[PDB]
Structures are given as C-alpha cells and as structure tokens.
C-alpha cells in the first residue's frame, strides 16, 4: 500500500514507472533500467558503478578500507534473477518500514521534502536545479525530465558500505543550507551485519549464544533517516566530527564519528553531543530556513515549467512549514520549526525504529560489526513484512531468535570478511609481543568534544523565557498531528539536456590512520591476558590449559582464571567409561567457577574478573575484590576522565521600581530559571559520563563475555582431543553430542553473564554517582547560595513595592533554594537496565553519604570517595577483633584528621545535613570529670562550624556561626543507676539539622532533644573533621568510636531507625558492652528478669545444680558513680562445638558447648533431658563425665521471623530436637536454672524480657570494677 505495483525486473519499459533513465553524471553515461516504486521515489537494481567515476572496478581496493568488516562480490547483482530478487526485497522492506507508525511518518516526510528551486542566477526568479532530476526514456525514444527525491541503487564495490550520496554545486552546500538535493542511497536487502549482544540476558534468559543479524529494515530506515536530513538540507557538516585520542597503547588506532551520524543513530550515541553544540546547529538551520522564506518572498517569476509560481511557492510553505500572512509574505515560526527539526533529528532515529520493529539491534555505533551474512528476505517462509525475521507462532518469535544466526541458520549464510583480522592494529609488548586488532581497543573521546557555557552569567528579567524526553507516547502525539495525504504532485517540466552533468557532493579528504605502531610496556596489559586465553585452533592435540602465563609461548598457550582444582581436573588422563563421566562433572565445575559471587553500593562482586583481564590497576595476585572495595569502580577504568564543571555563572535580576507584577514575575522567572540550571549541569554530567565512563565499562563487559567464551572453547577442545583417541569403536557406544555440551555451557555462560552485567552495571552508576555528579552538585549548591543572597536583597530593596507579600516571598525564596533538587537519571537516560540499577542505589541511604569511614584491607578509608585525605595519629588504636572500632586516647597524638576534597565541599553544606557514629564512652571515674567538657569530633574554622562534645553523663552537639551565636542539644544520662543502658556500652548517636528548623539528637534511634537553629546562621563549612580528645582533663581517659558518617541531608525518623538496624549486625551475638560475643572468653552472667542476682553452683556433678542467688553488691566512687556490681557469680565460657568460620565471633545459630568456671576449674553445663516434666534442671558436670547427657546449645540473637531478642541459649538433645532455652525456674523454693521449652513457645508470641534473657559481661577497663 506504499508500493502499489508488484514489479518484476523483466516487466517491460513503459516510460511512466518502468523506464530506462539517465542520471546526473560526470560526462556521458548510458542509461539504466529503473522502477518508480512511489511518487518521487525510484529504484535502480544495478551495482552503483556510475555515480563515483573514480571507482572503476568492483574488486577489493588495493589497500583495504579501515572498516571492521567488509565484503566484495564483483559478481553480485549481475544477473536478472538477482535483480528481480533485489527489486522485490527493497520493496518489501519499504512496506515493513511503512507498516510502523514512525515509518509511515519518515516516509511521508521524505516524499514531501522537495529539493529547492534553486538555481536561478537572478534574485527575482525560481529555477529548478538540474541534478535534482532525471531523464526518463520513453519507448519511442523521446525523453521527459522528472523531479525526484530519492533513488535506491545497488551498492558499490564494498557491498555493505551503504551510503547517502547527493550531487553538488559549485557554490551551494545543498544538504546543509535548507535547500536539499536528490538522495542516492547505495543499498542491498541481500546482505546484513552480524554483531554480538550481551545485555539481553537479564530479560530473555535462554538467549542464542553467538552472533545476531541486524534486521535489514533497520539499516534501510537508518539510510532513509540520513536521506531525510539531507532532503530538508539540515545535515550536520561532516568536517564536524567527534574526535578521539589515539596515542595511547589502549586507545583506538583511529575512528571517524560524524556528529551527523551521532544525531542520526539517536539513542545514547546522540547524547554525546553537548547542549551548547545541539543549540548551535538548530539556530543555524532555523536561520537557513529564514533565508529560504526570504528568497521565496523575493521571487516574482518562475521558469522551466507550466506550473504556477504560487502553486510552487506553496509547495515549500508546506515543506518547511512556513507561515503565510495575508499579503503572501512568508516567514518562519520559531515554534513550528523547533518541532519539525525535533522530528527530523530527534524522532527519526535508528534507535526509535528499533523500538518499533521490536527487533534486537546494536545499541551504540560502538558495538562493532563482527561479520557479514547473505540473507534472502523475499520468501515469506523466511521473513515477513510485520515480524521481520522473528516469525510469529514459531520457534523464532521467541527470544529475538529469528535473529540468532545459529538458531535460524538456514537463513544466514556466513561470508568472508574482507578486512583481515589484523588488517588494522597496534603492537603491545613487554620489557614477547602481540597484535591487537584496532577495533578491539578503547574509545577515548578528546575533551575538546565537550563544550558548555555553564560559566556564563545571565540577566533575569520579567520577560525572561521559560522552557518548555522522547517517549513513544510523545511520538504518538506527533503522528496524530501528521497530515497524511495532499501528496505533492508529479508536474511536467521543460526538458533538460539528454545528459545531466554533475559530480557527487565532494566529501573529505579523511586520512589513512597510522598502522601499528609499536608499544613497549612494563606490565602485561589486559589485551595480553586475553590472548593467552585464545588458541590454537587447531588440530593435533595441544590444549593443556595452564595458569601463570607465559602461556603465550606455546601452545598450549591457553591460560585460565580458574584454580589448580580445574586445571588439574582437565589435564588428565582419562578413559573410557569414566568419560561420561568426566563430562557432567565438568559442567558442574564450570558452573561453580563461573557463577561465583561475593560495602553497600556494589552489592554484587565478581571475584574472578581481576585475574581474567588483570584489572587493571593490575597489581597481583587476584584479591581484586579487596582492591575494588578500597578504591571504587575507578580501578576498572583504563583512563580516568576529567570532571570539569566551572564556577557557575551567577544571576542578576532586573529591578522594576514601583511595579508589583513585573517584580514578582522577575522573582518567579528567577527561581524557575534556576531549576533549568540544575538540569543543565546534571545533563552535561550524564553526557560526559555516558561517553567517557560507561563506554569503558561496556567494553570490559564485552571482554568478560569473551573470556568466558574462550574458556568454554578451550574446554570443548580438550574434551574432544580426548574423545577422539578412543573406542572407537564404542565410540559407537557412548553417543555424545557436543551440541548438548555447547548447549549447556552457553546456558551456563549466560547465567554468569547476568551476574557480571549487574556487577558492572552497579560499577558505572556508582562512578557517576560518587565521583562525577558530586563535582557538579557543589557548583550548583554555590550558585544556589549566591542567587539566594541576590534574591533577598531584591526583596528588601523593592520592599515598599511589595508591601503586602514580602513574608510570602521570603518563604518562597527560602524554601526553594534550601532544597537540593533531586538528580533523576530517568530524566537523562532512556535505558531500563541502568535506570533500575540507579533506582536500586538510591533506595539505600548510605550510598548517598558524603563521608563513610570504614576500615578496609588495612587502612581506614572513606567508601563515599569524598574525603581527600585521612591522617591517622601515631597512637590511634584499632581493635584487632573488629578494626572498625577506633580507640582514642587523651594523647594529642591519638587523633584522626579527615580532610575533604576541595572542589567537592561547598560553603552551605552544613545547613541541612546530619551525622551518625557509634561511640562507646567509659564510666567517668574522677572528680575532675564532674565539670569538664571536652570536644571529640571537631569541625570548626575560626569560631564557626559544628562540634560533638562530652561531659559527665552527657553527649553534646553544638552549632555556631558566623560571629555569634550557638545552639546546642544534649543527651543526658546518669551514673547513679543499677544497670545502665549507656555507661561503657556501644550507643548509636545520630544528629540531624535544618537551617530553617532545629538540631535534633537521636540515641539508638530514639529522639532525645531538639532546639531551634533557625535563629542563624549562617555556618562556615570547615574543610577539616578532627577526631581528638580536645580538652579532657582526665589524663587516663579515652573513648571508642566506630562507623562515622556524614549526610548532606536531614535524616527522618524511619531513615535513622533503618540506619540503626543495618549497622547493628543482628546476626552476630553481642556481649553486654555491645562487643562481638567471642568463644573461649570468660563472661559474668546477668539475668535480665532478675538483675539483682548472680549465678552459683551448689554442687558440681549431677547431684548438684546451678542457681540464682542474691544480692549482687554495689560498686561506687563517692560522688561519681554507684551501680550494681557486674563482675559477680560463676563464669561462662562459650566453647566451640562446630563452626567453620575461621574466627572467634559467636554467631546466630551457632551450636556450642557451655563451660562453667567453678573455683578455677572448667565444668560443662548439662542436664538429663528425660527428667519428667518440662523444666530440666541444669548442672555443672565434670567435662569428661558428661556422657550422653544433653549439652549442645544453639546460640541465638534472633528468632525465626527475625525479631531480635535476648534469649541466648537454646539447649538441645543429642538427637537435634529442641529441649528449651536456658532460664530459671522458681516461685517454689530456690531459683534453680532450667532448660524450659515454655520459653521457645513464649518468644514466638512476644518480645517481652524473660527468664531466658541473659547478658554476657566481660571485664573491660571502661567499667573498671575490681574483681
């Protein structure tokens, strides 16, 4: 219904739509048989042998094209049948494009965009440009000239080089001045590209394996897109390119990417063009449209036709959507234009078409082609107008299956790629050498490509202009505004001479990239680690895979990132009934070795990446995980991009004296214009991020897929080397199809790949989030700062004019500029895969910290990557059980200084922010501590800033700026008390602030004290956060501190609550002080249901029993403290039974022995379980005389569910069934200790304190009672 006739090549000439036609040519060309498939659109099913007069032969060029894949068939398209296939093929493809809403649009657009008139050396007059026509030869011999938009030719020598070619002029650049000219697309539906995807495994799990073929519809659309631009005369000059660095060993030898092509592809490639450049173009073509309007206006005469000047004028009014007034004066509506231009450049995109054809397609021009296939789309049993290759109701409608070249293998014949495997390369060596193929190298854009005016001041007026992403919804809205008839006519025109004279539009000029290119290097590079993995490749019987390369220098040059365990397991040595055998087992090993997994931003880590590609960074051996936690994703990147946001250009507002309305309109215009700003700066960052960072990650991603392939093949080889030596004989006895084997491992490889995708997904985002975005957010937060000043000085100054609404306006300005607008990636990316990784990364309040101080692999560091430097004092003490626990002494050299990065901190950052840390504060002991306040965390520059301090039973938060003027919150707690929740126990502090509100202080996630800070400030952002005991007048004093954090926002009740449980480690049991409960460490036992008793044994042996007696004493120091004695009673030791866990920390659900210390002899806690009744009376038995008595306890810190709990010890019989939790019986006599199943029942239904709630108290200098 787009192409109304079914043509057969052999159909005879008629001179209307089947005719021999001449074409614009350098000198004489004899004519060719063309078919006019649609009004304005012609097809010449003939190898383009005539448009470029300097391509004589269809033979491969003597020095080859720098193009990853290329194909040469000088016989192709030489017979009739071939042509007739061609004709039908292109036809069908048009119908395929036309069938989609977007295709209907692009296609109409084309037909409609008539090449301008044009030529006329005289102002007043219009003339047609001769090269924009053809001569159509009738049967009888006369010829008639025809106007023409679009010709499809068969291809030139390089068969797959599909181009858009025009004819030129001496003066005019017809494709870049709004004029347009006739497009000649070299094309073929008889071949298509083979590429590899490795991203669709996270949605379609059982996906192909090898290559997938590009749908020829997409390509044809692609070329039409280019045709479109050029017909409207809006193609970007191709001297305008995206220039790459090229000197580094890893950088891509060379590569031309034309801005035009970027825009054209669409999607995320298009996003490499910064805004300042996108606008330049648009303004430029708008102007080039204006000039057309005005030429129109000047024209008073028309030549070379029987048509009407006005008819023709109106042809163009319609093309360029010009606006006509009453007089006939034309002009360009900025608004109307803006849209057309958006549709030609932002809606007609390869990417959008792929949303429409719903096929699998490459995702960035950067996904290099890999091979070439011959296809035949004309038979319906092969490929239909609606489904393309992925035929509905078959095997192929599934996971882009139609497009898998393996799966649909009767539909793609593989071909010779004429570009050799190392036609273009660089040579990388060591102080051995390899060729690495140019196209396997890293793309590294020049900084030159990224411009902006972020630095430009702006004057806000009341006038000032307020703007006002590409969804399928939106396109619909475009489609519907489309008017889909009144198709520009075919009109009769005065004949042009028999031979139209014209040269093709002369391109650059682009030079031959220098060809490897020697590089002598110090490490093995990741290209080298990658060649090791290849072979070989290869018959007799090599393949003995081995780690520690030199592998290279063989074969069996075949390195693997696997363990001896596997390298040993395949370098035997096995027949023959044991092969069957072998195999299975090697499907398991592979799937454990490759499905391997393992911080809070990079949840999922792939350990074996380091060893695969020697990442990279590549100091060894492979504890890659460690290094990745330490430094960030930044270890993956091969080059580290520069993030260069300049000081944002400030606003300044126009005052409109004695006028209310224009003064408020200027404020509102100001505020909104700000909002644009954050978008402006963000977007830029995304653009920078996409091009220099995400690209490197996508290549490693490509490279990890490739190793996994290498490994699979190396295995396959070695299973087949063996198999081949055999029966065989039988041989015809153990039938075994490597298609099943290949079958399994690709499934397998796929399963690993969803992991690695995830992993590197988190990598890219996290990089953007914590080392790109921030450098920008500072600059914004500053621009914000100064606009506020500027706006409030505006209100004060115009205050009489504003009389009635000043407050209403200070509140406006003060709320909008105090809020940190939210980075939404969804606003800058279209991509489901990333958007959902980012959605996952925000969900977690800690990835958003600006300071996050963890001990990792032997250094205290900042996992948030803000902190510039961390100086650790000479006598800072790390707790060797849990190094995150820092001890600070009242030495001036027990101090940790954190110094933040300069261009990341901004003055107004402690105005809405928060801090958390766990502290452990020893009992105050001495009179001088009664009145002595001492700083411990200091953030103050010259009297201004914030600080945390301590005093006798107090934690103190203090704010102060800039010359006044403190506020202050307090947690207060007593030392005269039996058992303290707080004295010398780990407590979790959280401080929140809000410039227009109050400092709040929270203890273990309970709000304590709050006070108004709105009086101020403002505050002075200190570069320095110093952890030190400053001013403590207790020589012997010290504190413990851990997990320090800093947040650029005010944490709410539910956030801090969460924060509270995430850092609690609910899985590990804890002693009374809050430390990790450890095995083989004497504890004094405290029963919480009766805390005024301790434990005792009346008698050792089974005649005896344990019991609670009282009282506990007191401890005291006259005036300072008087608490319950804590080191009393008989001692418990948790002795390991089974574990693993190399270590000493008693975890939830650990099964243990409990020993009881009686008079410095260790005894074992046990009971007779068949003692009639529910409560079993526990005793202390001679460790060896226990026998078959019940003595195994489950250590607990949760239940079930996972409600935490203080019932610690569930006791079990030597069969594994519960007996009871250990507690105490009594209202009857004498509080003996029992295992009571009633507890286990009770905990399910309540969390109340019970007779089984124990706490384990170790001796600690911080409590300091004497035993």
């Amino acid at each position, epitope marked *: 219904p787009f192409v109304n006739k079914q043509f057969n090549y052999k159909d005879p000439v008629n001179g209307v739509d089947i005719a021999y036609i001449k074409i614009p040519n350098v000198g004489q060309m004899q004519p060719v048989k063309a078919f006019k498939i649609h009004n304005k659109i012609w097809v010449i099913p003939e190898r383009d042998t005539f448009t470029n007069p300097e391509e004589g032969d269809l033979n491969p060029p003597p020095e080859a094209k720098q193009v990853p894949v290329s194909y040469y068939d000088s016989t192709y398209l030489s017979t009739d049948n071939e042509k007739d296939n061609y004709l039908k093929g292109v036809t069908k493809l048009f119908e395929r494009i036309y069938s989609t809403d977007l295709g209907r649009m692009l296609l109409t657009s084309i037909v409609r965009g008539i090449p301008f008139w044009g030529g006329s050396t005289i102002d007043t007059e219009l003339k047609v440009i001769d090269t924009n026509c053809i001569n159509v030869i009738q049967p009888d011999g006369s010829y008639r000239s025809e106007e023409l938009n679009l010709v499809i030719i068969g291809p030139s020598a390089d068969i797959i080089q599909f181009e858009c070619k025009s004819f030129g002029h001496e003066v005019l650049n017809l494709t870049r001045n709004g004029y347009g000219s006739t497009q000649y697309i070299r094309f073929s539906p008889d071949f298509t590209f083979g590429f590899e995807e490795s991203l669709e495994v996270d949605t379609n799990p059982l996906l192909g394996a090898g290559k997938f073929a590009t749908d020829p519809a997409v390509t044809l659309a692609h070329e039409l897109i280019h045709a479109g631009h050029r017909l409207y005369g809006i193609a970007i000059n191709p001297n305008r390119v995206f220039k790459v660095n090229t000197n580094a060993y890893y950088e891509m030898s060379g590569l031309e990417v034309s801005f035009e092509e970027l825009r054209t592809f669409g999607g995320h490639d298009a996003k490499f063009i910064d805004s300042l450049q996108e606008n330049e173009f648009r303004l430029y073509y708008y102007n080039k449209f204006k000039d057309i309007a005005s030429t129109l206006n000047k024209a008073k005469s028309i030549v070379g036709t029987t048509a009407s000047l006005q008819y023709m004028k109106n042809v163009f009014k319609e093309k360029y959507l010009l606006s006509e007034d009453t007089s006939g004066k034309f002009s360009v509506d900025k608004l109307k234009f803006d849209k057309l231009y958006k549709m030609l450049t932002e809606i007609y995109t390869e990417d959008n078409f792929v949303k429409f054809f719903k096929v699998l397609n490459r995702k960035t021009y950067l996904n290099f082609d890999k091979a070439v296939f011959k296809i035949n789309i004309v038979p319906k049993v092969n490929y239909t107008i609606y489904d393309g290759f992925n035929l509905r109701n078959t095997n192929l409608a599934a996971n882009f299956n139609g497009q898998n070249t393996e799966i649909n293998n009767m539909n793609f014949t593989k071909l010779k790629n004429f570009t050799g495997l190392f036609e273009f390369y660089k040579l990388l060596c060591v102080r051995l050498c390899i060729k690495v193929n140019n196209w396997d190298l890293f793309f590294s854009p020049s900084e030159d490509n990224f411009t902006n005016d972020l630095n430009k001041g702006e004057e806000i007026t009341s006038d000032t202009n307020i703007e006002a992403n590409i969804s399928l919804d939106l396109i619909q809205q475009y489609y519907l505004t489309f008017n889909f008839d009144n198709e520009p006519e075919n009109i009769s025109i005065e004949n042009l001479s028999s031979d139209i004279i014209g040269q093709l539009e002369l391109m650059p000029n682009i030079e031959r990239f220098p060809n490897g290119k020697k590089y002598e290097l110090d490490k093995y590079t990741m290209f080298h680690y990658l060649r090791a993995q290849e072979f070989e490749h290869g018959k007799s019987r090599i393949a003995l895979t081995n780690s520690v390369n030199e592998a290279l220098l063989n074969p069996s040059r075949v390195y693997t990132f696997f363990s001896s365990d596997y390298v040993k397991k395949v370098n035997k040595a096995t027949e023959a009934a044991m092969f069957l055998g072998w195999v299975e087992q090697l499907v398991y090993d592979f799937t454990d070795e490759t499905s391997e997994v393992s911080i809070a931003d990079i949840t999922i880590i792939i350990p074996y990446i380091g060893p695969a590609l020697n990442i990279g960074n590549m100091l060894y051996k492979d504890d890659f995980v460690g290094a990745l936690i330490f430094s960030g994703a930044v270890i993956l990147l091969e080059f580290i991009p520069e993030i260069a946001i300049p000081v944002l250009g400030t606003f300044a507002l126009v005052s409109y004296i004695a006028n209310k309305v224009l003064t408020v309109q200027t404020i509102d215009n100001a505020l909104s214009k700000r909002n644009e700003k954050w978008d402006e700066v963000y977007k830029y960052i995304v653009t920078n991020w996409l091009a220099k960072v995400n690209t490197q990650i996508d290549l490693i991603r490509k490279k990890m897929k490739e190793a996994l392939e290498n490994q699979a093949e190396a295995t396959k080889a070695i299973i087949n080397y063996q198999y081949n030596q055999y029966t065989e004989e039988e041989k015809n006895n153990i039938n075994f199809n490597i298609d099943d084997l290949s079958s399994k491992l690709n499934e397998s490889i796929n399963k690993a790949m969803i992991n690695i995708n995830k992993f590197l997904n988190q990598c890219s985002v996290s990089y953007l989030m914590n080392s790109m975005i921030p450098y920008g957010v500072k600059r914004l937060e500053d621009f914000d700062a100064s606009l506020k000043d500027a706006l409030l000085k505006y209100i004060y100054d115009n205050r009489g004019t504003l009389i009635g609404q000043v407050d209403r306006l200070k509140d406006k300005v003060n709320n909008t500029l105090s809020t940190d607008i939210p980075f939404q990636l969804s606003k800058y990316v279209d991509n489901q895969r990333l958007l959902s990784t980012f959605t996952e990364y925000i969900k977690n309040i800690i990835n958003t910290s600006i300071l996050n101080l963890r001990y990792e692999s032997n250094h205290l560091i900042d996992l948030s990557r803000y902190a510039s430097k961390i100086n650790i004092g000479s006598k800072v003490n790390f707790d060797p059980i849990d190094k995150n626990q820092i001890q600070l002494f009242n030495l001036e050299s027990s101090k940790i200084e954190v110094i933040l990065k300069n261009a990341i901190v901004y003055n107004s950052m402690y105005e809405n922010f928060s801090t958390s840390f766990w502290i452990r504060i020893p009992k105050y002991f*001495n009179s001088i501590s009664l009145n002595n306040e001492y700083t411990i965390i200091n953030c103050m520059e010259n009297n201004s800033g914030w600080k945390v301090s301590l005093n006798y039973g107090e934690i103190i938060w203090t704010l102060q700026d800039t010359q006044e003027i403190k506020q202050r919150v307090v947690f207060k707690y007593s030392q005269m008390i039996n058992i303290s929740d707080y004295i010398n126990r780990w407590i979790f502090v959280t401080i929140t602030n809000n410039r227009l509100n109050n400092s709040k202080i929270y203890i273990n996630g309970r709000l304590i004290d709050q006070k108004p800070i709105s009086n101020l400030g403002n505050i002075h952002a200190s570069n320095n956060i110093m952890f030190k005991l400053d001013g403590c007048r207790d020589t012997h004093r010290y504190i413990w501190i851990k997990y320090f954090n800093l947040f650029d926002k005010e944490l709410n009740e539910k956030e801090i609550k969460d924060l509270y449980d995430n850092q609690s480690n609910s899985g590990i049991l804890k002693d009374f002080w809050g430390d990790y409960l450890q095995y083989d460490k004497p504890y004094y036992m405290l029963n919480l249901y009766d805390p005024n008793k301790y434990v005792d044994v009346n008698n050792v042996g089974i005649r005896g029993y344990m019991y609670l007696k009282g009282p506990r004493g007191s401890v005291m120091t006259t005036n300072i403290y008087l608490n319950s004695s804590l080191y009393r009673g008989t001692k418990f030791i948790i002795k390991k039974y089974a574990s693993g866990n190399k270590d000493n920390i008693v975890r939830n659900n650990d099964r243990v022995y409990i020993n009881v210390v009686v008079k410095n002899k260790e005894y074992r806690l046990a009971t007779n379980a068949s003692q009639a009744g529910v409560e079993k009376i526990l005793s202390a038995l001679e460790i060896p005389d226990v026998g078959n008595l019940s003595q195994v306890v489950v250590m607990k810190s949760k239940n079930d569910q996972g409600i935490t709990n203080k019932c610690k010890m569930n006791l079990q019989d030597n069969n594994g069934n519960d007996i009871g939790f250990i507690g105490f019986h009594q209202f009857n006599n004498i509080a003996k200790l029992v295992a009571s199943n009633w507890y286990n029942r009770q905990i399910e239904r309540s969390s109340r304190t019970l007779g089984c709630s124990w706490e384990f108290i170790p001796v600690d200098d911080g409590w300091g009672e004497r035993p």
Partner: antibody
Amino acid sequence: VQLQESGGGLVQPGGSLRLSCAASGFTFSDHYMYWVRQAPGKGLEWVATISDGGSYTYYSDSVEGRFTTSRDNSKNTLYLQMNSLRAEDTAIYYCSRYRYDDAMDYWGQGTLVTVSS
Amino acid sequence: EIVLTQSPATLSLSPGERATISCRASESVDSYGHSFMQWYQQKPGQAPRLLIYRASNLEPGIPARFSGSGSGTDFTLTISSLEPEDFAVYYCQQGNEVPFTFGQGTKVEIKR
C-alpha cells in the same frame, strides 16, 4: 637515653627565670612531660604536667598563674617559665618523661633554683 | 588534692629484714581498673628512681626484693630482704588525677 635540665641560679625575690630540659634517645614528640621540684632536704613536689602536642597544661595550685610550661617538639626541648618568684620556690627542679599510661620513668639530674634578696 | 599519708614516719632496720612501708589516700587512686600508685626510692643528692608503677608492677631492671601491692586508698611497698644500700627516703605517688601528689616520704635507716 637521657635528659638534661638547665637554667637555674640565684634569682631575686620578684624576679623571673627560664628552665630548659633537653631530651634525646626517644621519640620526644609522643610523651607527656612533667616538672617535679624538691626543696633542699624536703618532700618531692609536682609542679607542672604538659601533654605531648603541648596544648594542655596542668599546674599545681601552688605555682598556678606564676609558672608556665611549654615545649618546642622539633627541638626536643621542654621549658619552664618562672615569674615573680618567692622564697618558697627554692628547690632542685626535675623534668621527667611519663610513659603512657604508667609512670614518670625517666628523670634528669636537676638544676638548682634559689630565691633570695 | 588527694592527700597521701605515709607511715611510719621513720623506719630503722637491719639488713635482710622485712620493710613494710604504708601509703594511704584520702580519696581513691583508682580509675579504669588501675590503681595509679607509684613508689620511689631516693638516695640523697640523686633524682628519684622509679620502683613500682600502677601499685603492683615492678619496673624493668629493679630487683625482686621490692614488690608493690594494694588498691584504692591503701598501698604498701615491701622489701623482701632489705639491704644496707636500701637506706633511703621512699615515696609513694598518685598519678590518678591532678593535682598529682607525693607522700611526705619514709626514711629507711640501717641498723648495726
């Protein structure tokens, strides 16, 4: 591994004097330093303690506000500034190192200070 | 001002004897599970010499005859078998809190 406290002499009532204890043989910049005095044939007396970094000082009520201690860490020196002296300031003066957190373990010979008209 | 009362006043004793010296504090001398009681031997004309730190620990290179003990407000320095060379003033010192103080000393006199 010693120290070496000099300065002293016959000084007028009302007069002022500077004592200088020099240190070597151990990382000085780490330890708290103490000043202890002993009148001629009488009890020992604690005069001043100064922290490692030199930012915190303690003085016994007796000489508070009259004496000052300070340190020049980069020179391995300790100092005792001594103003408006009284006859009760007559004593031998000993500087000492305090090994954290145990005792004053190392001591100097001690220079003599004498106040009289 | 923690007063360190030290008794006896003087203490004359023939060699190889037992030499109890009793120190005692008006206020506690204990913080962080440590008694901060030092002991000092001072022969005439020489800088005090440390003997026992934290009430109970013997200083490296000091001999066995000296031994510390006590806790809180009641410490005691014993000389397992006196010498002649252990005629000396002996001093207890609290380092628990400022103002650090010394006792007023105990003069070991030798017999014959």
